[PDB]
Symmetry: C6
């Protein structure tokens, strides 16, 4: 993070141990579930590229995904270098590889290199989540005795990682969902099959 | 949340990791019990629409309920658009088409877009709790050997999610409850059947 | 709680997550043991009526007791309305039902937070006395039960709600009577050790 | 505790949830082991009589010991009333204990009158009497076993002595022969090293 | 760490119990996995040589590795003594924290004796991790039924402690990886063998 | 610890509950392993003699070691009395016959907190050396024991209290002698892997 000290000068404060421990445990528990992305953006709130690299490097496993994340960052870094031919921050400076912590603080017209690099990380993380999703949306079909509440929970869970809701329901609930007709809210659909 | 910095300027402070972890665990534990609503309003105390979206996005499961919550927010947003620095529209209060600085601008006539959007969330969450309630208040009936204390605990628990208390009691306690007559407090009714 | 900000103005600070989590777990663990009342008064230190309602609403189960607590608060609110016919805080304003957070801070000088806390502790004591399983008359020392444990059970029941010597076993009762009048509890436990 | 606000005024700050939870769990775990007394004085650091009553009231069980503690507080309160006859008002014994005194009065007395440290002295005094009573074994019965290592026997010896020549007397004949050969003026380091 | 007090003087603040407890537990859990190095640099943020020795001394086991770390520090200290022949000038032993007081270390911090000594520790820790790695990169071969995702997870995990990825794959996936040809990203390679 | 308050006056701040709880649990877990000494110096950072006594008194068991620690403190206190606002004597530095304000007063600034901590760490080192089970001469590598583990046990014992090559098994010992003089521990462990 960044803080203005007593003398009014903007200095970098150290990332808290609670933040570091939280980000490590959520990846150990949730791996790459869709809810990991908002937690990262929340835990990395107001972070510098130096701090963002600290949180990513502390991740232990999933080195296949972390290698793919590096490739996506290099692709966005080359795009920044193309669109854009105190010094001007290049793509490698935003990622935090060829830029000091004071330079990153210096750029923060104010250049938010922390939010720009976080945009590249979240963009690369979304691609990993879509890949590591086990089931596709077409295979999510309600069982015979499965409650409609659970089937919709599985349906939109898959859809978050990646008409049709009524098509994959069982014939007992599908008969009820079609009778509701068009313009039925999800509240009315779950209440009808309860 | 919002904080006045050393320079006197209102800046957005990052939501604490304890708040984020607390809100995630309570939803994992309590799902959608009625006591989840007061915990959300407590943990999201003084939050901006940007912060409220962060806490909702970190929720992992229950994507069926979160989709219903989005629909309820869009309905309340359209009502705000009908009844009504730029003026905050319904999508600006929800946090979709408004920056974090704009949301801070309206809060610090002061427009409490955080409390307005929180009112819509609590309104939408109450509808989910009433749906996910398993038993109806008419089906809560005291067993033969069930203590009256436990039956009343189950009675008002269901009533919180959604004369009659005496009607559903067992004939042993019901004989005692009628003898008390009208104007009997709950203290006297539980004391009589102990 | 309440805090004075940098500008000197009294603003409401948000109740900490540790306080909220603590109050939830103690009610889950201890239910309504007598030691829950001092914990509530401790965790709700310097709280506003808005904060007191927040801690009570977070309680999950025990809705029978929470319904009785509401009735006791309404009774104390009506008594405040009778004794007492920026606006004047009525009984419903102190409880936090018909009063904003700024009004409650405004009255705080009227300590609407401590007054409403007095009604809650008053209503909670009535719940603890009801949920106490045993009566003080039934607490009797067993034949082989140590006197230390029997006194632990005796004053535990007495906290929820001469006689100590009467309910003791004939082995310890003979010793306790021999001490005579004016015997401290230290001397009574030391004699039957 | 007490804290000076931004405006320079002495206000009472609320006892932290960590302190309250710590004091509750240590009594649940350790009951009344001698190490509970220094933990109480540490957790109740800079506390007012109002705060000290809060920590004692949060104790769940051991109501027999808490009843004896109240009697010891009343005994020390009567002694304070005698040594200081009651004529900012002068704090009497009941004011120091926190029964007949408001939180502002207790802060007011803090010549500065440390009513918080005085009442804490009475509590620690009363708690020591409970620890000495609840001690199971007496120092005379702590005897080393045949195969018990001397390190463990000394651990049990001074543990009992904390709740309440002789160390050599109660040792087994194998270690006692070695301890007497060392003679007088032997440190505990040399006594434990000799029987290792 | 170092802090400027109210009087403007730079004083050493005590390392937090959370930081010390975190560093102890991560070494007990992870031993010397590659992700321990970024955690050390994160927990020891802005630390003095006195603080760095405190964190290293609190490590209980692994005294063989800690003895190797001391030798690597002595080697880097001798190199500093050579490049810099001897407020006094900080020699190699002063940077390590053996022959220098806490006030002298604060005094030099501008000479970043904390970051210099941390560079030697991370340098020595990398050598320990490379040694304690069990398998070599040449022995990481995909099993017959092992999913490609897991094999790549093991591949880059070993490579982090220490063409070839396609060579060690099973003939079923190797046939697919060669068909992709040159210039294939890791995203395309994992998607092809899913 | 010590803190300068808002008025600029140096007051004693209370030791945190995390510090007290940490020091109690580490002694319960690690007893008197060598790594307990750096943890104590870390947890007692910037502490007064009053604070140092608080951490030592909270230790429950190991009263034999705590009794030896008192004797070592008395020995260092007598040495201070021989070699030497009132002047701090040996008993004042230990915290027995000196108030908390006097200890703050002495902090020419006299660091009575660091002086007394030096005596405690000195006395604790003597306890660790005694409670060490095995001697360095008895640490011998087994037949199938990996050299990494044997060196882990070797320097672990040496921390509590040529020879590394002498006690190795003949398989690794043949390799260690072939390396000759001037071999680093990195080379010795790499050779026997």
């Amino acid at each position: 993070p960044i803080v203005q000290n007593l003398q009014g000068q903007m200095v970098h404060q150290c990332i808290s141990p609670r933040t570091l421990n939280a980000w490590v445990k959520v990846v150990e528990e949730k791996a790459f579930s869709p809810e990991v992305i908002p937690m990262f953006s929340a835990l990395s709130c107001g972070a510098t590229p130096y701090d963002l690299n600290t949180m990513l490097n502390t991740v232990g496993g999933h080195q296949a995904a972390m290698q793919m994340l590096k490739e996506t960052i290099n692709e966005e870094a080359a795009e920044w270098d193309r669109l854009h031919p105190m010094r001007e921050p290049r793509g490698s400076d935003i990622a935090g590889t060829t830029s000091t912590l004071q330079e990153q603080i210096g750029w923060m017209p104010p250049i938010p290199v922390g939010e720009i690099y976080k945009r590249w990380i979240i963009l690369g993380l979304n691609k990993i989540v879509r890949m590591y999703s086990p089931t596709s949306i077409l295979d999510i079909r309600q069982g015979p005795k499965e409650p409609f509440r659970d089937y919709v929970d599985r349906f939109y869970k898959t859809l978050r990682a990646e008409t049709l809701l009524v098509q994959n329901a069982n014939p007992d609930c599908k008969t009820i969902l079609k009778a509701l007709g068009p313009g039925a809210t999800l509240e009315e659909m779950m209440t009808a099959c309860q």
